[PDB]
Write a protein that binds this ligand. Structure first.
Ligand SMILES: Nc1ncnc2c1ncn2[C@@H]1O[C@H](COP(=O)(O)OP(=O)(O)OP(O)(O)=S)[C@@H](O)[C@H]1O
Ligand SMILES: Nc1ncnc2c1ncn2[C@@H]1O[C@H](COP(=O)(O)OP(=O)(O)OP(O)(O)=S)[C@@H](O)[C@H]1O
Ligand SMILES: [Mg+2]
Ligand SMILES: [Mg+2]
Ligand SMILES: [Mg+2]
Ligand SMILES: [Mg+2]
Ligand SMILES: [Mg+2]
Ligand SMILES: [Mg+2]
Lengths: 898, 898
C-alpha cells in the first residue's frame, strides 16, 4: 500500500489547540548562529544614544495613547508567533467546506440529477451544506472557548500607557501579545522579559540568560553600557531578549522588537522550519484518520463497481456509494477532538484548573508518575514557628536584626523566610534599622553557592555584608563566630557541635537558615561574589513549615488512582524524610544529587524507577531524573514554580505550574492550577480521564455504526434491483445521528474506565469496528428480507417504500445502539447515560419516526409506512439490542474494553 | 376577636420534624422526685444476685438470637421516646384527608348537586381527593427522607448478638433504638449509656452522672456493690442510667430498662406533660396559620352572603365560596415546611452536613454569632513538632518514658498528646516499658483538678504514680524536681524560672504539658485523688498544633457573610492569642474565666458582646456565656465535641457537633458535621439560607396569588348574573398551580437575599399579600369586562364561555406572576429561575391553554375559546407582568424585601 504522500484528505487541527507552544523561550542551542543581519541592528540599538531613541521608535517618556499604540501595532505587527494567529471565520468556514468529500458529493449529485431531475441535486447539496455548517459551528465554538481559556492565564507586562486619555497615564497589566514596539515598561523580580528591551534605567538588575547564552550565572544589566567592547549581541549589558527572566533588581526599559522581529522569533530558528516532529496525540489522530481513509478506500469502490455493473447507472452508483462512505469521513475527527476535550476543559475551569492546550489532557489523563516539590504541595508555605537562636541555643536579637537587614533591602524573589522575618520584627526596631542602614549593593541568589547576600552601610566609612542561606553553604565560607558574645575563630569542634545541633533540629522537621555578617572599610568599587569570604557567623534561624491538612488524603487518593507520587526536592534529606513520614508518604531510601551526578543513564533510570524521595538536587538533576523516568511506557508529569523549573517542565510529558508563580514557569507549563493543591490536581485528573474516555467513546460509536451500515449496504445490492436507500435518505440519517451524538461529550463515564491511567491504542478502534459492525448488518439484511417478502417490495416501481422502511430502522438503530455500547456493564441497571444523551436520543428517534409521515416525505422521496411495520420494527430493535448485549462479553474477554 | 381555643383547623407537624429531641439526657432538675414505685424495682435490681439475673430477663451470657430479641422487642417495646414513633401511612393519609376544609368541600358539593345533578358532585370530590393525595405524597416523601437522614447519625451500642446464626456471636453496632431489655453490651470511654444497665463486669469504670445527680465528679461503677447501704437508686454503684457517659474504664453490662421504662423515660418527668412550650419556628408557623385562617374567615363569608342574597342559591354559593377559599387553606403549610426544608437537607447531605430536625435550618440560617473551640476548628488535631525537655531545657528520655507509661495504660478519652507520645516512643523501649510496668489503678480526668493520673508497678513492693496535665495544675501539687539529675526541693525561684520559660514557649504557640512521678510503698488500698501530692516534677512536653490551611479563608468568608466568630477555649490565653493572630482572627482583649465568674449577668452579657477570645473557661462558664449572649436578638450557635459540652449545646439556639465526637455531643446536638471544618459549615450556612428563602418565597407566592383571586371574585358578583367561575374550575386551577409550584423548592436564590442573616417576620406576609393581591384583581376585572362586553357573555345561558375565558388567564396569571415576583431585581436579565421551575411553568401553561380545547372540557363544563381571545389574553398577561414589575419598587422602598 504505502502512498501516504499521495493521500492528502487529512485535515489537521490548528497548532494552537494541540501541540505545545513553539516558544518555550529556550528551546535548544542553535547551530546556524543566527542571521548576521539582525546582529548588527541589535548592536547598533545597544550602542545607540538614549536621547535619539525616542524619535527612532516614536515613543515619549510619558507613554503611548490609544491611537499611537494602534498605529504601531498595525505597522509592525502583533507580539505573537505566526502559528498563534487564529484564522478568520470565513476562512475557517471555507476550509471546513472545500474538503474533497463534500465537493465530490455535490459534483456527483449534480451529475446524476443534471438532466430533467432538478430539485433532486439541489437538496442533496443543501444537506451536505447543512452538515458542513454544523461541523463549522461546533469547531468554531470549541476553538473560541479554548482560546479564551488559554488567554485567561497569560504573562502580563506593566506598561505606562494613558488611563485618563488626557495624559494622566499610570500602570496597567496586559497580556504580552499587545506589547507593540517602542513601548515603555518596568520590570521586577520574577517577571519574564516580554520582548527585546533597551534598558533605560536599572537598579541592580540581574537577569538569567541561561536560555540563550547557556550560562547559569545571572548577568548584570545597566542603563548605560559598562562593558568595554561590543560586537557580542547576546552579551551586551544594555539589552534584554525575550524569553529571559529577571532574577533580581528593578528596571525600566523600552520595547525594541516584537513578534518574529525578536531574537527568539527568527534568529533562534523557531520561525524557520521547526514543524517536522508532531507529538503523540497528533500521531494518534493521524493514525485514526489513515485507518478511516483506508477503510473507505477498501469498501466504497467495491460498492460502486458492484452497483454500476449490476444496474448500469455508474453515476448514480458513485453518488450512492459516496453517500454511504460519508459516515466514515475523517472530517468529523476535528470536531470531536475540538469539541469533547473543550467541554471537559470548561469543567476543569470550574475546578480551578486551566488547560492551555487541549492535547495535554491526554497526558493529563495518563500521568502515572507525578514529580513534585515538597513546599507548597506537601507543606504550607507560611511558617508557624520560628525562633532566632545562636550557636549556644539562646535567643539572639542580633541574628533577627541581621536577618531583617538582609530580607528587607534585598530585591530578589520573596521567600517565606523573608516574609516571616519582616512580620516577626517589631515596628520600632524595623524603623530604627531602616533609618540607620542603607543599601549599597546586592549579590543575588546564584543558586550554585546558594547564598543570598546584601551589602549595607550606616556610615561613609564602613560597609556591613549580611548573607543568609542554607547552613552548609554559609559554614563553608565562615571563619569567625560570635559565640558567647565574642569574636572567636570557628574551629572544627564548634563546626561539629553546630552540625549535631542542626541535624537534631532537622530530624524534628525544622529547617535551618544561617546568617553571616562581615565588616569592611568603605569601598566605592561594586561588590561581587568574591567578597563573600571570612564571614562572621551570627546564628541559625530555625523554622517549621507545617504539612497541609489535605496533603495526606490527596496523596492517598492519588496513589489509589494509580498516580505514583515522587518528590524531587532541593533541601536537606532529613527534613524531606520527616515531611514524607508526617504526610504518610513512604520515603524508603533518600538519594542525594551528588550520587546521581556520577551514575550512568540506565543506572539512574532504574534508581528513579525504584525511589520516591530525591533530596539535594540541582535543576539539572531534576531535569535529568524527569527525562530518564520516561524510559519505559511511563508518562511523567512535573510540577514546579521556580525560575529554573522551566527546562524540567518542558522535559516532562506534561508540565504543571501554579497560577501564583514566576512568569516563566506559567508560560512554559502546560496546565495552570489556580492554587497549589494536590486535591485539585486529583479531581482534575479524574475529570480529564472522563473527558478522554468520552471522546474515545464518541469516535468508537460514530465509526462502528457507520461501518455497520456500510457493510449492510455492501452485501445488499447483488440481490436487489434498486438502491436500498436513496443518498438523500442516507445524508438525513447521518445528520440526525450526528445531532444525536452532539450530547455524547456530556455523557457519564463508568468509574471502572477512570480508575487507572488510560493508554490509548488507535489500532483497537479497527478491532472494535470489525466486532461491532456486522451485528447491525445482520438486522439490516433482516429488514431487507422483511420488506421484500412480507411487504412485497419486489419491483423498482415500489422501491421507495422499501427504502423508507429500512431508513427508519437504520436511524433508530444508530440512535439506540449507543445506549448499549457505552459500557462494559449492563445498561440501564448497572449504569445509565446522562440526561442530555437521553433527551437527544428520544428527540432523534421521534424525528426519525415522524419523517416518513411528514409532508416533506414526498419531497424527500419517502413513502408513508403501514402500521403493520411497527411491531416488526420493535422486534428487530429489541433483538438487535439483546444480541449486542450478549455478544459484548466475547469482545470483553478476547481483548478488553480499556 | 381572640377565640384561639375555638379555632382548631390548624394541623401541626409531628414533633420529630421540628422541635428539639425531648431527650437531651439531662433536661433539668426534677421536683416530683420521681415515682416511688420505680425506685424500689431499681434498688431490687441493683441488689439482685447475678446468677438469677439471667432467668429474670431471659438472657444468656452468649447473647440473644434473632427470635429472642424480636420477642423481647414485641413484649417490652422499642428503645425510643413515645414522641419518636412515626405514624402509619394509612393513619397519615387519613389525618391528611379528614381536615375540615376538604370534608366541607365534599359535603357542600354533594348537597348542591344531589338532586338530578350527578357526575357533578362526584367529580368535585375526585378533585379534592387528588389534592389530598398530592399533599400526602409530598409530606410522606419528605418525612421519609428526613427520618432516614436523622437515623444516619445516631448513637451506636456494641452488642454480642449472633452473627453466624449458629451461636458464633461477635460484636455489632446498632442504633440505640433497637436495644431490647435483657441485652448484653460492652462499654468504653466516650460511649453514652443507651439504657439502664446492670453492671456485670467492670475494669475501672468511671461515668459522669452530673446529668442526674448533679455532681460533676465521676462516680465509680463496680461489678458487685461495694457501697455499704442501698436505698439511693441514683447513687447505687452497680447500675448506670440512660443519658450518662463513660468517662473512663471498660465494662460489660446487661440492659434492664428500655424506652419509657428507663429512669429518664418517666421518672424524669419527660413523659408526663413537657409539651407546653413550643420553639420559635413552631410559633411562626402557628402565626402564619392563624393569619390565613383569619383572612379566610374575614373574606369567604362575605362572598357567601353576597352570592346567596343576589342569586338565591345559598348551597351553591357556599360551595363556590369554599372553593375560592381553598387556595388560602393552611393544609398547604405542612407540605411546604415538610418538603422545601427536606430538599435543602438532602443537598446538605451532599455537603457533609447532616441535619437532625428540619427547624434547626432556620436557626442555622440566622446564626449571627458562632462560638467554637480552637483545636479541631482553628488548628489541626494532629501535632507536628513535639520535644520532651526538662527544667533546664535539655532533652530528657525519662520524661518521654513517663509520658508513655501514663498514656499507654490510661483508659480515658484519647488525647493528641497520647497519640503523639505513643507514636514518638520507639518500639523497643515501648516493649521494655510494657513488660516492666503494669497497671494497678487509675484516676480519671476530673476536669476540675485537670490532672489525669495512673498508678503502675514493676515489683510487688513499690508503686509509681505518673500524672500529666496543664502546667499550672501540675505545679500546684509538685514538691520536688529532678533538676540536674538530683531530687532537689522545688523552690519559688525555680517555679518562677519555669513559669518564665513556659510563658516564652506559649507565646510562640507551643502548649505545655507537665509530667510528675511519685513513689509509694506497695499499698493494697485503691488510690484516690488525695494521693496526688508531693509529686516529683520530671519535665514539660512542648508541642505545636499547626493552624489549618482552610481556617483563615473560611473565617474570612464567615465574617463576610455576617457570622461573628467567637472563641471559647479552655487553654492558656497566650496560646489562644497566638493561634488567633496566626489564623488572622482578631482577638482584641482576652478574658479569663476567673473574672467572668464574679461579674453580673448584664456585665458579662455586655462583655461577651464586646469580646472575641475567652480563655481558661470551665464548661459552666461556656454555658453561661452562651446563654447570656442571646440577650438581644442574637441567635448564637455553639460548636463542641466534648463530654461537658452537651449543656452548652442545648443552651445555644443551634448546637453543632462533629461526627467524630463523643456520643453525648452527637446526641445532644442539632446539626452533625461529617468533619471538623469551618468551610463546610460556611457552605452549609449558605445552602440553609437558600432553603429558608425558598420556603418563604413559596409561601408568599401561594398565599398572594390565592388572595388576589379571592379579592377578584369578591368584587365581581354584584354585577354578574352568574358565577364568575365554577368550583370545579377553581379546584382545577388550584391543583395545576400547586403542580407548578412543586418545583419552587428547587428555585434559585438571589445572592442579595443570602448575604445576611435572615430574620423571619411572619407579619410581613400579610403586608406582602395585601400589596401584591389587588394587582391580579384589576386584570381579573378587566377580563370580566372583556368577556361581558366584547364577547357578549351577558346572559346565564352563555355563562360557561365567560367562566372558561377567565379560567385560562386566571391560571396563566398564577403560573406566570411567579417569574416576576421571585426577585427584588428585574427578571430574566438580572436574575433567572431554575430550569425545573421553567419546565413546570411551561407545562402548566400548556395544560391550562389546552384544557378548554380538550374533550374533557364538556365534562368539566368548559367551552372552547374563540381565537380572538388569544391576543387579548396575551396583552392582559403582558400588562399585568409589567405593572407588577413597575410597582415592585414601591413595595421594596416602603418596607423592603428582606
Ligand atoms: N532567588 C532564589 N531562587 C531560588 N531559590 C532561592 C532564591 N533565594 C533563596 N532561595 C532559596 O533556595 C531554595 C531553593 O528552592 P527551589 O527548589 O528553587 O524552589 P522551592 O519552591 O523553594 O522548592 P524547594 O525549596 O526545593 S522545597 C528556596 O526554597 C529558598 O529557600
Ligand atoms: N477526659 C478528659 N476530658 C476533658 N479534657 C481532658 C481529658 N483528659 C485530658 N483533657 C485535657 O483537657 C483539655 C480540655 O479541653 P476541652 O475544652 O474539654 O476539649 P477540647 O476539644 O480539647 O477543646 P480545648 O482543649 O479547650 S482547645 C483537653 O484539650 C485535654 O488537653
Ligand atoms: Mg510579569
Ligand atoms: Mg549593583
Ligand atoms: Mg442502521
Ligand atoms: Mg458508642
Ligand atoms: Mg480502680
Ligand atoms: Mg388569575
Amino acid at each position: 500500500m504505502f502512498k501516504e504522500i499521495f493521500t492528502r484528505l487529512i485535515r489537521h487541527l490548528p497548532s494552537r489547540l494541540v501541540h505545545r507552544d513553539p516558544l518555550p523561550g529556550a528551546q535548544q542551542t542553535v547551530n546556524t548562529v543566527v542571521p548576521p543581519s539582525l546582529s548588527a541592528h541589535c548592536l547598533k540599538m545597544a550602542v545607540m544614544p538614549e536621547e535619539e531613541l525616542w524619535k527612532t521608535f516614536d515613543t515619549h517618556p510619558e507613554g503611548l495613547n490609544q491611537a499611537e499604540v494602534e498605529s504601531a501595532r498595525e505597522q509592525h505587527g502583533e507580539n505573537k508567533l505566526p502559528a498563534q494567529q487564529p484564522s478568520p471565520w470565513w476562512v475557517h468556514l471555507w476550509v471546513c467546506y472545500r474538503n474533497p468529500f463534500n465537493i465530490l458529493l455535490t459534483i456527483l449529485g449534480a451529475i446524476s440529477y443534471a438532466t430533467e431531475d432538478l430539485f433532486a441535486a439541489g437538496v442533496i447539496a443543501l444537506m451536505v451544506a447543512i452538515s458542513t455548517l454544523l461541523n463549522f459551528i461546533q469547531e468554531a465554538r470549541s476553538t473560541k472557548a479554548a482560546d479564551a481559556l488559554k488567554a485567561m492565564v497569560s504573562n502580563t507586562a506593566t506598561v505606562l500607557r494613558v488611563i485618563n486619555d488626557k495624559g494622566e497615564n499610570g500602570w496597567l497589566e496586559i497580556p504580552i501579545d499587545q506589547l507593540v514596539p517602542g513601548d515603555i515598561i518596568k520590570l521586577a523580580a520574577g517577571d519574564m522579559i516580554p520582548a527585546d528591551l533597551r534598558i533605560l534605567q536599572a537598579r541592580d538588575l540581574f537577569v538569567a540568560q541561561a536560555s540563550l547564552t547557556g550560562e547559569s550565572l545571572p548577568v548584570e544589566k545597566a542603563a548605560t553600557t559598562r562593558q568595554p567592547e561590543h560586537s557580542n549581541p547576546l552579551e551586551c549589558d544594555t539589552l534584554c531578549f525575550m524569553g529571559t527572566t529577571v532574577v533580581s533588581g528593578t528596571a525600566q526599559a523600552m520595547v525594541i522588537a516584537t513578534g518574529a522581529n525578536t531574537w527568539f522569533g527568527q534568529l533562534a530558528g523557531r520561525v524557520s522550519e521547526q514543524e517536522s516532529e508532531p507529538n503523540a496525540f497528533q500521531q494518534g489522530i493521524s493514525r485514526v484518520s489513515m485507518l478511516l481513509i483506508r477503510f473507505m478506500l477498501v469498501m466504497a469502490p467495491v460498492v460502486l463497481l458492484i452497483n454500476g455493473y449490476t444496474k448500469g447507472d455508474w453515476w448514480e452508483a458513485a453518488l450512492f456509494a459516496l453517500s454511504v462512505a460519508v459516515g466514515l469521513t475523517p472530517e468529523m475527527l476535528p470536531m470531536i477532538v475540538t469539541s469533547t476535550l473543550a467541554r471537559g476543559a470548561v469543567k476543569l475551569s470550574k475546578q480551578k484548573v486551566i488547560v492551555k492546550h487541549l492535547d495535554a489532557i491526554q497526558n493529563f489523563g495518563a500521568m502515572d508518575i507525578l514529580c513534585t516539590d515538597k513546599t507548597g504541595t506537601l507543606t504550607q508555605d507560611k511558617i508557624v514557628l520560628e525562633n532566632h537562636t545562636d550557636i549556644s541555643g539562646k535567643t539572639s536579637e542580633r541574628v533577627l536584626h541581621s536577618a531583617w537587614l538582609n530580607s528587607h533591602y534585598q530585591t530578589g524573589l520573596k521567600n517565606l523566610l523573608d516574609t516571616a522575618v519582616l512580620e516577626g520584627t517589631d515596628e520600632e526596631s524595623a524603623r530604627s534599622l531602616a533609618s540607620r542602614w542603607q543599601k549599597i549593593d546586592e549579590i543575588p541568589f546564584d543558586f550554585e553557592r546558594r547564598r543570598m547576600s546584601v551589602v549595607v552601610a550606616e556610615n561613609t566609612e564602613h560597609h556591613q555584608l549580611v548573607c543568609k542561606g542554607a547552613l552548609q553553604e554559609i559554614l563553608n565560607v565562615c571563619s569567625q563566630v560570635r559565640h558567647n558574645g565574642e569574636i572567636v575563630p570557628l574551629d572544627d569542634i564548634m563546626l561539629r557541635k553546630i552540625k549535631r545541633v542542626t541535624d537534631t533540629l532537622n530530624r524534628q522537621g525544622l529547617r535551618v537558615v544561617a546568617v553571616a555578617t562581615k565588616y569592611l572599610p568603605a569601598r566605592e568599587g561594586d561588590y561581587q561574589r568574591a567578597d563573600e569570604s571570612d564571614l562572621i557567623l551570627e546564628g541559625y534561624i530555625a523554622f517549621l513549615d507545617p504539612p497541609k491538612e489535605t496533603t495526606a488524603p490527596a496523596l492517598k487518593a492519588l496513589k489509589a488512582s494509580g498516580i505514583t507520587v515522587k518528590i524531587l526536592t532541593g533541601d536537606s534529606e532529613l527534613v524531606a524524610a520527616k515531611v514524607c513520614h508526617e504526610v504518610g508518604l513512604d520515603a524508603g531510601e533518600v538519594v542525594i544529587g551528588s550520587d546521581i551526578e556520577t551514575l550512568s543513564d540506565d543506572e539512574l533510570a532504574n534508581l528513579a524507577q525504584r525511589t520516591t524521595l530525591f533530596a539535594r538536587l540541582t535543576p539539572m538533576h531534576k531535569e535529568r531524573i524527569v527525562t530518564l523516568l520516561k524510559r519505559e511506557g511511563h508518562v511523567v508529569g512535573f510540577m514546579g514554580d521556580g525560575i529554573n523549573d522551566a527546562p524540567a517542565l518542558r522535559a516532562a510529558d506534561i508540565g504543571i505550574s501554579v497560577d501564583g508563580a514566576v512568569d516563566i514557569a506559567r508560560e512554559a507549563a502546560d496546565i495552570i492550577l489556580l492554587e497549589k493543591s494536590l486535591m485539585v490536581l486529583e479531581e482534575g485528573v479524574i475529570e480529564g480521564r472522563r473527558t478522554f474516555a468520552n471522546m474515545l467513546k464518541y469516535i468508537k460509536m460514530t465509526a462502528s455504526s457507520n461501518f455497520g451500515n456500510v457493510f449492510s449496504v455492501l452485501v445488499a445490492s447483488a440481490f436487489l434491483p434498486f438502491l436500498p436507500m436513496l443518498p438523500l435518505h442516507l445524508l438525513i440519517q447521518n445528520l440526525l445521528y450526528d445531532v444525536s451524538q452532539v450530547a455524547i461529550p456530556f455523557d457519564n463515564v463508568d468509574d471502572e474506565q477512570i480508575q487507572k491511567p488510560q493508554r490509548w491504542n488507535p489500532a483497537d478502534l479497527g478491532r472494535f469496528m470489525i466486532f461491532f459492525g456486522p451485528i447491525s448488518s445482520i438486522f439490516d439484511i433482516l429488514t431487507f428480507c422483511l420488506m421484500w417478502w412480507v411487504f412485497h417490495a419486489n419491483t423498482p416501481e415500489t422501491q421507495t417504500l422499501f427504502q423508507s422502511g429500512w431508513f427508519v430502522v437504520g436511524l433508530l438503530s444508530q440512535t439506540l445502539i449507543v445506549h448499549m455500547i457505552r459500557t462494559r456493564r449492563v445498561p440501564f441497571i448497572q449504569s445509565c447515560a446522562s440526561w442530555p444523551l437521553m433527551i437527544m436520543t428520544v428527540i432523534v428517534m421521534i424525528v426519525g419516526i415522524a419523517l416518513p409521515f411528514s409532508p416533506l416525505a414526498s419531497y424527500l422521496q419517502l413513502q408513508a409506512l403501514p402500521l403493520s411495520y411497527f411491531p416488526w420494527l420493535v422486534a428487530i430493535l429489541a433483538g438487535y439490542m439483546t444480541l449486542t448485549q450478549l455478544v459484548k462479553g466475547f469482545y470483553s474477554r478476547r481483548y478488553g474494553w480499556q
